[PDB]
Write a protein that binds this DNA or RNA. Structure first.
Ligand SMILES: [Ca+2]
Lengths: 96, 61, 97
DNA sequence: CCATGTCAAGCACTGGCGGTGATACCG
DNA sequence: CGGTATCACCGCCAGTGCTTGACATGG
């Protein structure tokens, strides 16, 4: 019952770009949704929910996926990439 | 054997049992995924899933 | 099924360090738990929970706190800051398009 | 041919993230 | 009074465990 609330159009676009990178590179990187999931500490269906726009990406998982797929986060989600940059500003000890 | 038995101790008894049955350690036959499935009451695919998780589990420590 | 999970020891420390930074700089910055919550879009029980070790920090709230309090994240949580930098490596590396 | 194994997608289910808000308490 | 403390309560969804339908392949 009680179907899961749909993500935002932007999130859905993020996911579609993510999956497309995945499909395009899986052979040469030698990945399956399953093997990707393992590198991320999770299961196959969990990774799948992310690729198919069912579950939202967070910054942590996006970064993980970018590293696994060997692409920049900017290639699937610009808004998550900006969010990560925003957080990075906060590790900067800056001048006196 | 025991180094093995205690080596299969980091996994759930179910994950361990799936491997032992696949590798013939319980009864002498290298059961198929379907056979192990029927043993555990689930499909061959879920046994495949479990086995993979178990192998990745003992190949990281 | 306890609705809330307890913090690890490291999470408690990060909290203490966080709180101490609030206590030390609240005056120069004209901050209250309340005013800090307002900057973060939550309530004062929200902030209190983070300052007191009731709720763990996450990367986003840590970055916010650090910006409100004018310090770097690693002054209260070196592990969260490491997580932040690693995440930023994924924005930097392997560009195309 | 098809038994065996692999992959990806869908869904019922739940731990715990990430808070809320009176109200009573402190200096 | 301006601040803080916690009690005291929980919606919600990201991820799980399993299934199903498609498909690849050595024998
Ligand atoms: Ca809010």
């Amino acid at each position: 019952s009680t179907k899961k609330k749909p993500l935002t159009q932007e999130q859905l676009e993020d996911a579609r770009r993510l999956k497309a990178i995945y499909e395009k590179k899986k052979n040469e990187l030698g990945l399956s949704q399953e093997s990707v999931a393992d590198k991320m500490g999770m299961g196959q269906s969990g990774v799948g929910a992310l690729f198919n726009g069912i579950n939202a990406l967070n910054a942590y998982n996006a970064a993980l996926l970018a590293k696994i797929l060997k692409v920049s986060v900017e290639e699937f989600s610009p808004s998550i990439a900006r969010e990560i940059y925003e957080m990075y500003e906060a590790v900067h000890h800056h001048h006196h | 054997s025991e180094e093995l038995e205690k080596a299969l101790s980091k996994l759930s008894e179910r994950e361990a049992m799936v491997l032992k049955l696949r590798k013939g350690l319980i009864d002498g036959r290298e059961h198929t995924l379907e056979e192990v499935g029927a043993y555990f009451g689930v499909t061959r695919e879920r046994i495949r899933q479990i086995e993979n998780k178990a192998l990745r589990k003992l190949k990281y420590h």
